């Protein structure tokens, strides 16, 4: 069983004070805090094993290359890829998606074709497809939202046709916490010969992810949101699709310039740390924390929530008519870190006819007590400003 | 005055053993070792100040944004840029050059134009221009080498004309250690309205670099070669050239996706560390170490050296008719790390009619004693295999 107090003890930032008050870090969806096992694994590599990694002759370089390829293998097991060679080290989810849009998109999407995204996508899964469509004269189509923050699945027959080359879809919305029915959507897409890229940046820390079971063609996620270092992400490419991506041999073709070995070592340690805790244990604790928060938040007057009741990870909200920026500033003044703004999801904001929302993340190291501070803080803000 | 023993004490890898023997790390040009001030600055950020950085409302996010912008300012002072906003955080020199080739190259190089590179360039300063030239139907022209590893400057009048849009040139050759006459070459290039991109990845650790005095239009270098973390480099863009680079406002337009704040913090600490030592002190010590090495190497039979006598940082060599790979393996078997292969400079190898060379780097933490081990090792290898 999960013990949040033991987990929290691994994270040295969580003891920090902010504005003289104990930090309540509810912004893990923007970036997660890192355990000392991750911090120290990277530091130890720099301290005792550092070298360049291009199968250099000498010992440190050869040992560092092997360390990096062992992390690649561990990442492929983490997402149940068939082969370690299907995994590409990228700088982040943003770059991984862009890499696919140029390497695969440029030679597989032609004039008169269409690409399907959704109205809940992060900008990182919108802009590369907008650019590709303008480059080649294709059409970008958008699955719309329901008020509850789920996709209007009934619109799929009007969007998928013989010229649909790609579906690019978020696994979990970074704003609403909606989890999309990927397996079923992928079956549909493949019936038309379309490939599927999954943006999984908000999925891989909340429960197991199996790309063989999903049968997705591309899958991308971010190291820094998986309790890992910045500057490193993972792009999964189904080995079959390398024949559609013209250029040495794969993974390494897509890793030009010096690898971020520091970040790779830390990412490996983060996968180990998460696996040692167990993703199903994490899921169970976070789901219970989420249910406690949504129940307590019922007692906040004039609170508006956006998204489905079964959200993962994040709670998007606005308080009365107060601007999200001001709600966020008051919460920060209490030592509570939430995120405000458009969350790199302006089409989603436009759908709800707001310019901005507040967002609280509830991660595996957050507590019922921190939820209580958020609830109390929102009540205080409402009294003081209403 | 420089004390190499005090410097070496800051670098924990240098006490490492390899093949049971004390490491002699002569491969800093591939990647440099890092002092604990750099390692710990990054670790400390992760331990006590970590957050996302998009001017997020809350305190940690705001303080982290300010940390990253202070590193940007420190980097601009380090290279004497006019304004911190002229500096772009990139993933590395490879990506920084590619960024210029697409952002500036695509909208300033047209059919029938030409771009000038040199025969000593790293592939990172060749491939983006080859690609751009094929995209737009321009011509790629190459300044050839002299046997001594210097540029054939007399060929410039046949290469520069009214259609020359860009000169892309290495500050210091990663193989030969040749330092090119940038200031003069930049005057010539600007007389034809051509811009100049300088690849400075092997320059910025050896002596001061002043982009205002050079008047270069772009300048790029790598964090991991400047005693800093991996996954981070610097691209300098003369502010005037942002009008020629169409798209928010600059530096930040060219930094999509999450910044590598871990790497940025470590890069700042590396600049501080290098500045505290003093680049002129470093230059003086490395020049004396180099002169000692070239003098001692005279006593190695059948040694071939490539490059000018006034090289910086690296000594490229081959031993008799033995393959560089085998020379490198014997040296590694003695605990001495050199690099072998084509060094990402195949046109340079082809000019010298060899497939590969050995390369020893002599950095600020290397010693006369390590030079003696290299000399002894080469004599031993020659006896044993001749
Ligand atoms: C954060 C995020 C991204 C961007 O990921 P980076 O690694 O920062 O580039 C893309 N998509 C989603 C859903 C995200 O939450
Ligand atoms: C190492 C090097 C590069 C590549 O730099 P990265 O930061 O590894 O991408 C480019 N040019 C020269 C001269 C180099 O030495």
Author numbering:
A (entry chain A), B (entry chain A): 2 to 248, 268 to 406
Paper excerpt:
SufS is a pyridoxal-5′-phosphate–dependent enzyme that uses cysteine to generate alanine and an active-site persulfide (C364-S-S-). The SufS persulfide is protected from external oxidants/reductants and requires the transpersulfurase, SufE, to accept the persulfide to complete the SufS catalytic cycle. The β-latch contains four key components: the α6 helix, a glycine-rich loop, a β-hairpin, and a cis-proline. R92 and E96 (E. coli numbering) form cross-dimer electrostatic interactions with the α6 helix of the adjacent monomer, and N99 forms hydrogen bonds to the backbone amide and carbonyl of G251 in the glycine-rich loop.
We generated variants of SufS with either alanine or aspartate at position N99 and solved the crystal structures of the resulting proteins. Alteration of N99 results in significant, but localized, perturbations in components of the β-latch structural element. The most drastic effect is seen in the N99D SufS structure. In this structure, electron density is missing for residues 248 to 268, which includes the glycine-rich loop (G251-S254) and the β-hairpin (I256-T266). Additional perturbations are seen for residues R92 and E96 on the α6 helix. In the N99D SufS structure, the loss of density for the glycine-rich loop and the β-hairpin suggests increased solvent access to the active-site persulfide. In the absence of TCEP (open symbols), both WT and N99D SufS exhibit near identical alanine production kinetics to the WT enzyme in the presence of TCEP. Results for this experiment demonstrate that N99D SufS no longer inhibits the active-site persulfide from reacting with TCEP, consistent with the model that a key biological role of the β-latch is to shield the active-site persulfide from off-pathway reactions. When cysteine is added to N99D SufS, a rapid decrease of ∼50% is seen at ∼420 nm with a corresponding increase at ∼340 nm, similar to the results with the WT enzyme. However, the species do not persist, and the initial 420 nm absorbance state is regained after only 10 to 15 min rather than the 2-h time frame for the wildtype enzyme.
